[PDB]
Design a protein around this ligand. Structure first.
Ligand SMILES: Cc1ccc(-c2cc3c(N[C@@H](c4ccc5c(c4)CCO5)P(=O)(O)O)ncnc3s2)cc1
Ligand SMILES: Cc1ccc(-c2cc3c(N[C@@H](c4ccc5c(c4)CCO5)P(=O)(O)O)ncnc3s2)cc1
Ligand SMILES: [Cl-]
Ligand SMILES: [Cl-]
Ligand SMILES: [Cl-]
Ligand SMILES: [Cl-]
Lengths: 336, 336
């Protein structure tokens, strides 16, 4: 990833040139440029890069001409745009202030709820690019369907989340069956399955069974990834993470609170109930302490270990005939 | 349309049954059901019905088996869902209160900005249905691309609109070149081109030139349709329209204000400037009077006539080899 990151970001400028070239609509296109530059840039690009890297592990290097690669870059960027769409819109729904410590787009002066359109444009740019760069490829329809299905799964996950945590404190809502379901639909499918699957299609690997196999490994990785973000949000060194966590404040249906609830004597249940999600820090400090007293960081470390054996068993069993390195590169990024 | 309206609405119940049938996500699916029922029902269904009617004018009746028709119904409903998506989201952006005199969805208790997701789900349901009912048809990809392109054009139109009227009163913004551009992208492509084009594809009529021809007629119809809504908003008998108009109050870039501005001596320009878009009625009453004094209803009636010759010339010239009745049925609905 480290090398390839550079040429991935050089390509953006071109993604944009193309998306911004009927002159009556110039102003709108100017706006689109801003929206793209503000919202698609500034993350770590892990998802989009995954498309590119996996495309290289999957194609015999004699089928990686400069146009094959230009498409891999572009489709990686399609993943990033999809993400950008979700985030811009999620920030609005959450009433968030910052994203990656920068002002959320909808919070910029004179944008506001216009960001809903802007988010929709981001989504749309995915399908323009696919047409621009892949309309003639045999995997074209495969990729349209995959991006569409990934949007649907994500949106559904979002609904499930929204129902489950209404900003209305209800911890009967916060069960494990349900936590898992949210992670899977809202983040894992697009974060993990999507980018690999896209590379699979670009490589001619379109079998339903192959995709199902890759899916079984990749959704389980995504479940751990998110559980680890939940853990880190509260317990990560915040300069090593970058994030300074607001989960508890926010009534989030976090892995921490789920385990906590399986592990509460009633005295502990109507304490947690008197504390999950106030601005004031001593009520949030108090929760961190209930978690600490229940050795939740230990439950996690136990979880991280088991999860790691499980992912390697899954890779042993279901990678074939993809090179296991497709999966292992990702495992290394996440269990780091 | 009058007969066919009935079976068009009987089909909805089935669109829904299908979209609502992995049980961990039941709650979200319940929500989706509500969203669909609230937002897809209650309009006049003109756009979706246009798909169905045109499909019948375009297919030899021996190729209208019960499954061909079930698809026409479904694709008509796809148009309505697309519209529903735009409206739910537009209401949020506008801060509107009611839609068709019923509470806008985002204004319902406990929905709020969650409606952004809800709107996204509506969009997504289009592509699920297309897959469910058309994946095996030779026009499948054609329809995906058309719905996607129609979304993009609409969203772009919305951007252009948003730039042009920022709720910030600026009438230098409100030019005719620009009014036309907004109408075309924001409403005409999806309202007029989309439904016919969809029927064309379903019927094997996929030539770029045929579509371009149909487009030239249909975008010009859409331009008149919207100009007429602008006129009616202020001058329609409000029980015959149903609507009681808020355009002037809203700084809308309306046809009325555009013509008005071409037809203003400076004394009239810095009057209009002191009045376009206040809550108070005497400032809105005053505008209606400036419009009246400039014989704008007459400019309109002159416009409606000319526009009608023009549409029939266009139909004469560009309908072939579609039956002109495809276009004429629509002209009759709109010049009524
Ligand atoms: C398919 C796939 C998905 C995710 C990742 C990784 C994300 C990530 C990571 N991301 C974190 C992160 C992402 C973007 C970002 C920051 C942290 C701060 C600046 O912007 P997170 O998404 O958990 O808040 N940090 C350290 N290592 C990794 S590995 C790798 C592969
Ligand atoms: C492709 C096509 C597009 C639009 C139409 C027509 C819409 C319409 C119409 N619609 C008006 C209307 C639509 C829905 C609605 C109301 C009025 C009140 C109840 O819900 P509008 O959309 O201008 O506010 N009213 C009377 N005749 C017609 S013909 C016909 C065909
Ligand atoms: Cl990332
Ligand atoms: Cl090539
Ligand atoms: Cl209608
Ligand atoms: Cl059939």
């Amino acid at each position: 990833y480290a090398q390839e990151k550079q040429d991935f970001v050089q390509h953006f400028s071109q993604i944009v040139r193309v998306l911004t070239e009927h002159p009556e609509i110039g102003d709108a296109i100017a706006r689109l440029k801003e929206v793209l530059e503000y919202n698609a840039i500034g993350g770590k690009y892990n998802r989009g890069l995954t498309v590119v890297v996996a495309f290289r592990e999957l194609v015999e290097p004699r089928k990686q001409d400069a146009d094959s690669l230009q498409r891999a870059w572009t489709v990686g960027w399609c993943v990033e745009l999809l993400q950008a769409f979700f985030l811009v819109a999620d920030d609005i729904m959450d009433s968030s202030l910052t994203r990656r410590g920068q002002i959320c787009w909808y919070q910029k002066p004179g944008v506001g709820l216009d960001a809903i359109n802007d988010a929709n444009l981001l989504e749309a740019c995915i399908y323009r690019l696919l047409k621009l760069y892949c309309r003639e490829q045999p995997y074209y329809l495969n990729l349209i369907e995959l991006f569409l299905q990934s949007s649907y799964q994500t949106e559904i996950g979002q609904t499930l989340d929204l129902l489950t945590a209404p900003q209305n404190v209800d911890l009967v809502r916060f069960t494990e069956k349900r936590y898992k379901s949210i992670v899977k639909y809202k983040t894992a499918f697009y974060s993990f399955y999507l980018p690999i699957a896209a590379a699979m299609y670009m490589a001619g690997i379109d079998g339903e069974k192959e995709h199902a196999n890759a899916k079984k490994i990749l959704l389980e990785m995504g479940e751990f990834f998110q559980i680890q973000d939940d853990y880190l949000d509260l317990f990560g060194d915040p300069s090593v993470t970058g994030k300074i966590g607001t989960d508890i404040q926010d009534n989030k249906c976090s892995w921490l609170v789920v385990q906590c609830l399986q592990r509460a004597t009633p005295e502990q249940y109507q304490i947690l109930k008197e504390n999950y999600g106030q601005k004031e820090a001593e009520k949030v400090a108090r929760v961190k302490a209930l978690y600490e007293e229940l050795d939740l960081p230990a439950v996690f470390l136990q979880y991280e270990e088991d999860s790691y054996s499980h992912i390697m068993a899954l890779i042993e069993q279901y990678a074939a005939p993809l090179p296991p390195a497709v999966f292992l590169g990702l495992a290394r990024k996440i269990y780091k």
